[PDB]
Design a protein around this ligand. Structure first.
Ligand SMILES: [Fe+3]
Ligand SMILES: [Fe+3]
Lengths: 309, 308
């Protein structure tokens, strides 16, 4: 028995889990590591001999794309009852973890009670607190672009533009990664920036002091970012692949996601870091959107068009 | 109700206790103190003690509690779970292990040039022109355990020699391991002896940091074992045994590896890929009797030499 996984998630995240699954089950697992976008391309040129069994994606959007193309199998209630939220409308993939957009800040240099209630108001807050040149962002980062796509869905292009241009007027510093940006907050180069919650979790665990601000309920700045996995219609190993999806939603694998990776789990029965907002409170702060249908290409166009990207 | 006297920190313990209560209904009360203060408290309290479990930061403290007749023997069911470190007395269970290691700036120091033995660190440091650019943590529990391991392996005279040679490197003392690793990041120091999980945490945050293991059996690879024991006085044996069973469960063991960064002691726990596998890590540690570590001798030595 064998299993082939196309993974848009990183090898450092996936490998330890695949190894334990192999050790436990006797099933040989082969993984192809790529980006979600590149996997979507590969899936549309697949042979019939040894096709992939599973698509494990970094984003709901990529799985929604695979689903829209009719490449994914329906999943059953036995599996889909496990995650507490974010089960797709299509019901053709299972959400595995969630990552929350947040506002990171240095708590010694920035006062928690003064931070704005909406991401849209960040430029005004910065402007009025004297922080021109002291705001970071990550324009080339996947989740940042997802967040902008969220803003387009919720607010339309003009409020999003005014936001993008008002941010640009702040002379913000762009970082090639989130750890780079959080290191710059530590350094004193910038005081705050929009990021994913788990980067803050990782910095705190290393002993660094970072604040984690959430915007008002439903704000675009709180976008929930879901990872997930789907069974390919041409899987020749249906039982083994379903077994692997079940494994990803198991208490121990979910503790690995919370623990080794820092992401939010989607099952109960798992222990969170102290000072980390509990899972269901975190979910309540995110806007209600179809994560399978975020206007990502419009966001990218709008970012490329405005010279932020 | 279940009452735990914990030598482990609240940051580490709280999430596990919260989950155990939610799943069992058992109300858990934890007293947070140091291993040393818990040992004193348990004796002072005698048969009056409300303590069901002693969850220790160090195997040495469980050794003392056992030698002093405080602990109940445990069942084979529990003691067959850990892969290593189960006491002969069978009166407590190991839960995690941490390894002493040498952290270093991998841009300034070449992995292949590092010394095979902790005893040779002063020679290496002086050869590489690192006077005033070595860090250490003289007030930290695991550093003191490491010095105690050196007395056990090499004797007091060789350990005294090392301590004085270390002092002549004009090392920078840090009150915490994160502060030392931040100094390595800053370029203030180039290397320092630490616990493996501190390096794991820094790496997970995106920082590059080298992690050196010494030759098999070296004092610089000391295994630092945590564990828990059931107190003879306990009137809540069922809940206490349920809790120990939980600590050795795969999900709890994944918490230790993931949330905390420590090595697990049960099979089937997924570690970060760049971390030396469990059994390989254990193989490099000196094979000392955990309950015999001469910590008092080490503290006296550190005080005489003016390190403390
Ligand atoms: Fe990321
Ligand atoms: Fe520590």
């Amino acid at each position: 028995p064998t299993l082939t996984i196309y993974s848009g998630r990183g090898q450092s995240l996936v490998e330890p889990l695949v190894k334990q699954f192999e050790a436990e089950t006797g099933i040989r697992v082969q993984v192809r590591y790529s980006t979600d976008a590149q996997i979507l391309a590969a899936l549309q040129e697949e042979g019939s001999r040894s096709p992939a069994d599973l698509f494990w994606a970094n984003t709901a959007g990529a799985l929604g794309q695979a689903s829209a193309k009719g490449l994914l199998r329906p999943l059953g209630e036995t599996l889909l009852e496990k995650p507490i939220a974010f089960v797709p409308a299509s019901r053709t993939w299972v959400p595995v973890t969630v990552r929350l957009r947040v506002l990171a800040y240095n708590p010694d240099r920035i006062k928690a009670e003064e931070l704005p209630e909406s991401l849209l108001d960040l430029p005004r807050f910065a402007r009025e607190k004297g922080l021109v040149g002291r705001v970071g962002w990550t324009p080339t980062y996947s989740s940042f672009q997802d967040m902008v796509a969220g803003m387009i869905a919720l607010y339309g292009e003009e409020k999003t533009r005014e936001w993008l241009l008002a941010m640009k007027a702040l002379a913000p510093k762009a970082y090639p990664s989130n750890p780079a940006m959080l290191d710059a907050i530590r350094a004193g180069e910038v005081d705050l920036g929009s990021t994913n919650h788990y980067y803050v979790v990782r910095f705190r665990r290393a002993g660094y002091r970072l604040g984690m601000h959430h915007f008002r309920d439903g704000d675009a700045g709180n976008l929930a970012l879901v990872t997930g996995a789907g069974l390919l219609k041409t899987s020749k190993n249906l039982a083994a692949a379903t077994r692997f999806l079940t494994y990803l939603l198991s208490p121990q694998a979910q503790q690995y996601f919370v623990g080794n990776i820092g992401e939010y789990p989607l099952v109960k029965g798992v222990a969170l870091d102290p000072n980390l907002l509990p899972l269901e409170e975190a979910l309540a702060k995110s806007p209600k959107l179809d994560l399978e249908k975020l206007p990502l290409d419009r966001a990218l166009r709008l970012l490329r068009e405005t010279g932020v990207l």
